[model samples]
Target: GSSGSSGIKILMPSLSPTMEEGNIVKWLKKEGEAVSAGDALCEIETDKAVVTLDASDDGILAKIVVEEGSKNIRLGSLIGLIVEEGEDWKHVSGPSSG
Candidate 1:
């Protein structure tokens, strides 16, 4: 059986190894919505170009810590929270550390 974690963090991914940070251009998915793997989560502006960041897990978008148009977001920075399917996303906890 495939067991999904209770809480998962959506991070500002490093699209390229050379890229250090990026800008959040827009979010395609909204909080409280279901996000499937490979779903376009948001449009992020990297050094090369603006690209869509896809979801890596099947879960509910519990929270969005980073807003659109924010700049210079470091790679691996926690931007959002995702909860496993059927969980109460409203009560999900936040990042453990900054």
Candidate 2:
């Protein structure tokens, strides 16, 4: 796990604490699928309710960059990517892990 040990980074949270932004009410893992580290990577609907954006780190499901219903996505943003394993990471790009 060296050559740029690629992977990890799926923000878009802060579900209150006066949540700055959030509304991606869906996306249980898609891009390349296969995400672990607690899994359940999607379904947010803040302002106080429905929140399940687990998966802090694992592999695959790399690159989603927000989609499902997307509304005011701000708190942390960069919403997807876990890569690592074989690392195709879908044309892997910027910020280290899209």
Candidate 3:
């Protein structure tokens, strides 16, 4: 049987009330890697300090839209895509649990 892919979208989280932009310092997980929930994915630099971003869902790191050190991306911007094990997520859009 074919299992569908479940996708989780990673967005730019606001670190401060006045923060309009952030710098992606590093990516702890590379593209095509598997990530469990609560795993640290990357570090973001805000006006205050460096903060780590966690994986909210368990899945495979299928895509990374933003490169490390990207700046000025808005909140809710698509940063990465997570697809479930043994599933294909090449055509999925937005958020999905398939």
Candidate 4:
């Protein structure tokens, strides 16, 4: 989440090298909810193991692109967005790729 800009993008992290994609186990923070840096964002299951997604920046969770149990989410994919404080989340964007 260390985007250092208006908002930070939440990604399906890579737990290990050679890890191409994974399954979204669950979302800890829902849409339009508040979250902080290092906060738990969600749970994901890679080929290796299940891990929690830590927020990279402090802000409100504007959207969730991939729902719980979503599989094959490539590493660094757009899973959600964290809208910075005072930023208008009226026109939030979703995942752009498969």
lDDT of 2 by residue, 1-98 (tens): 44464467778867577888888888887888787777788888887778878876678887787878988888877877677866776675567554
Off by over 4 Å in 2: 1-22, 25-35, 39-43, 46-50, 56-58, 65-69, 72-84, 92-98
Best by TM-score: 1
Residue pairs of candidate 1 with colliding backbone atoms:
none
**Lowest lDDT block of 10, candidate 2:** 1-10
lDDT of 2: 0.77
User: In model 3, how large is the Cα lDDT of residue 57?
Assistant: 83
Where does candidate 3 clash, by residue pair? none
Decreasing lDDT order of the candidates: 1, 3, 2, 4
Give the range of the ten consecutive residues with the poorest summed lDDT in model 1. 89-98
lDDT of 4: 0.76
Better of 1 and 3 by TM-score: 1
Candidate 1 lDDT over residue span 2-78, tens digit each:
43454898888877667888888998988899999998999988888778889988899998999788999988888
Indicate the TM-score of model 2.
0.31
Error of 3 at 70 (Å): 0.9
lDDT of 4 by residue, 1-98 (tens): 43234567777777667788888788898888888878888887866677777777789888888889788888879888878764556563447311
Off by over 4 Å in 3: 1-6, 89-98
Stretches > 4 Å off in candidate 1? 1-5, 92-98
RMSD of 2: 10.9
Q: All candidates' lDDT scores? A: 0.84, 0.77, 0.79, 0.76
